Amino acid sequence: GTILLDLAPEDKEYQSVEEEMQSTIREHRDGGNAGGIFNRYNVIRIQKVVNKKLRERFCHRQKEVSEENHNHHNERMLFHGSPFINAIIHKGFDERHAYIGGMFGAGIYFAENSSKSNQYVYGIGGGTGCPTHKDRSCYICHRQMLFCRVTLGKSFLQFSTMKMAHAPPGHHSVIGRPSVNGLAYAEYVIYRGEQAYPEYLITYQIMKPE
Numbered sequence: 001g002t003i004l005l006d007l008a009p010e011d012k013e014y015q016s017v018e019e020e021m022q023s024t025i026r027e028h029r030d031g032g033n034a035g036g037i038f039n040r041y042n043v044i045r046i047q048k049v050v051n052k053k054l055r056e057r058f059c060h061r062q063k064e065v066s067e068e069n070h071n072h073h074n075e076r077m078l079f080h081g082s083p084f085i086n087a088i089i090h091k092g093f094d095e096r097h098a099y100i101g102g103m104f105g106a107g108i109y110f111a112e113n114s115s116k117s118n119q120y121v122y123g124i125g126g127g128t129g130c131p132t133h134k135d136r137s138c139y140i141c142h143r144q145m146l147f148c149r150v151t152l153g154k155s156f157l158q159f160s161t162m163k164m165a166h167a168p169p170g171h172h173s174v175i176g177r178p179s180v181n182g183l184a185y186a187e188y189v190i191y192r193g194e195q196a197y198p199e200y201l202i203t204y205q206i207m208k209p210e
């Protein structure tokens, strides 16, 4: 199955991952309703996800995408947050659990900003918050998000991605780009679970502002 390898805080890989997370905290126009109010994270664990079967499916797909994108697979390290982390790290991402509805197409979404992904940790718009206190801004309960390897290949740019079922012909991913009456930040979407590898499992808590 999967093997989770703990990284030590003195390891530069650990430091690297935490910096990208802490440094990509942004202002969200919702007053912190979805992800909570914080200026910082308390990263309490970072585990490397080792799964040979998964890495091989990922690499094989990366090869097909390459063939179709003039030999560039176009890999990008992005964040993902959702209530299904434990399923993802063991079974990998699966498009079959992605459905067209609301503001989402039938794909798997990613963000370059950790605070964006944080908003989805407990569900769309934060859902009802943590399981124990039903608090979207809970500072007690431990949250988890993934910093993943995402194969974007040839991306199709657009303003909305809510009614997509697959990437457009000739493409392998879709990026919802910013717009005045639309998105505030870009969102990266894949429609095949094997186009993303859950490299890092980050366990953390948002911290209250001091």
Ligand SMILES: N#Cc1ccc(O[C@H]2CC[C@H](NC(=O)CCSc3nc4ccccc4c(=O)[nH]3)CC2)cc1
Pocket (backbone or CB within 6 Å): 079, 080, 081, 082, 084, 087, 088, 091, 092, 093, 094, 095, 097, 098, 104, 107, 108, 109, 110, 111, 116, 117, 118, 120, 187, 188
């Ligand atoms: N049971 C079960 C089971 C259930 C689901 C599963 O894989 C799912 C496959 C589809 C995913 N669903 C999504 O990707 C969309 C909603 S979660 C989300 N939305 C964003 C929007 C913009 C920017 C960043 C993010 C982000 O970080 N997370 C969730 C996980 C695998 C196993």
Ligand SMILES: [Zn+2]
Pocket (backbone or CB within 6 Å): 130, 131, 132, 133, 134, 135, 138, 139, 140, 141
């Ligand atoms: Zn809680």
